[PDB]
Enzyme design. Sequence first.
Site, mmCIF file in Angstrom:
data_model
loop_
_atom_site.group_PDB
_atom_site.id
_atom_site.type_symbol
_atom_site.label_atom_id
_atom_site.label_comp_id
_atom_site.label_asym_id
_atom_site.label_seq_id
_atom_site.Cartn_x
_atom_site.Cartn_y
_atom_site.Cartn_z
ATOM 1 N N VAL A 139 0.832 -1.205 0.000
ATOM 2 C CA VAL A 139 0.000 0.000 0.000
ATOM 3 C C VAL A 139 0.879 1.273 0.000
ATOM 4 O O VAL A 139 1.939 1.292 0.621
ATOM 5 C CB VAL A 139 -1.013 -0.034 1.180
ATOM 6 C CG1 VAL A 139 -0.330 -0.299 2.520
ATOM 7 C CG2 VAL A 139 -1.886 1.216 1.238
ATOM 8 N N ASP A 141 7.156 -3.689 -15.422
ATOM 9 C CA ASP A 141 5.711 -3.567 -15.234
ATOM 10 C C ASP A 141 5.217 -2.126 -15.439
ATOM 11 O O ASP A 141 4.469 -1.568 -14.614
ATOM 12 C CB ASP A 141 5.300 -4.116 -13.864
ATOM 13 C CG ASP A 141 3.796 -4.327 -13.718
ATOM 14 O OD1 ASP A 141 3.121 -4.556 -14.752
ATOM 15 O OD2 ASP A 141 3.285 -4.177 -12.588
#
Length: 282
Positions: free
Chosen positions: A17, A122
């Site tokens: 997170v 990514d």
Amino acid sequence: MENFQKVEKIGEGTYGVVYKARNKLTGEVVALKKIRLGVPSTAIREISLLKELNHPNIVKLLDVIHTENKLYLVFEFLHQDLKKFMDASALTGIPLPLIKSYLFQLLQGLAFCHSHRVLHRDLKPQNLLINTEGAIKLADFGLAREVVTLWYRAPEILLGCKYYSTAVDIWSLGCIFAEMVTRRALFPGDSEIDQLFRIFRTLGTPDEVVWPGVTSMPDYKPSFPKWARQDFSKVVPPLDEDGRSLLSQMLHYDPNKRISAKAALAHPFFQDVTKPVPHLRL
Ligand SMILES: NS(=O)(=O)c1ccc(N/N=C2\C(=O)Nc3ccc(C(=O)NCCc4c[nH]cn4)cc32)cc1
């Protein structure tokens, strides 16, 4: 970690997170990432290398806090991601000079990382961050070394190549370039085979002619349907011939034929590159 005050949750990735936070010691506003895991020695050494990989188009890794089996990464904070900007600009489209500036800047960032043998692996609109000055920066970098999005995955990864190259980042950036231009994702697959087959339906099923060695790849199947290639004039209208030529080189099947970030910076598409200021509503 008592030195930081959380402001709000700004996202959630595969690692962990991300919070917007304030540094009580410097007054600095930062992005704090809590890595979900104590921490392996291999990860500490690799992440410590990223602290030195500094470039204007790379989100700065300010500090690595390894405390009580938990790992926290302190990053430079930027106010918006390219995903939100693309959604906000969808009715009008991002102006071509701004698309061009953003692509040029990201290729500068990749040329730098790739020169240091660092791959992103990514790239996606969600880890491309922008500011009011017209800058764009690469986030969530050499960390690879909710459902995970496959839309920007290079075909060699999908076909099972374990030792892929810096070409995977050029493929992802080509996909993002097409999406900025058309206002629609180029290959929005929802499974690995749907992703592969969407690529094949647009660029043609790869064979030994266009990609030597493709038929010997781990997940290659001779039973793959054979689709014919489509024109880029149909794929990314109304992009001009310079942009379509560059995009075609970024989307070559063979990673060895795929243009490098350094060669892409010299492409005639960037002859008239400028640095416009975006209209950002924060
Ligand atoms: N949606 S928004 O336009 O309002 C908006 C506003 C601010 C921001 N900032 N993010 C960041 C920032 O400033 N430094 C960063 C350093 C690293 C990361 C990072 O590891 N990200 C991967 C996990 C993830 C997050 N989000 C989806 N996956 C993120 C940021 C992002 C979006």
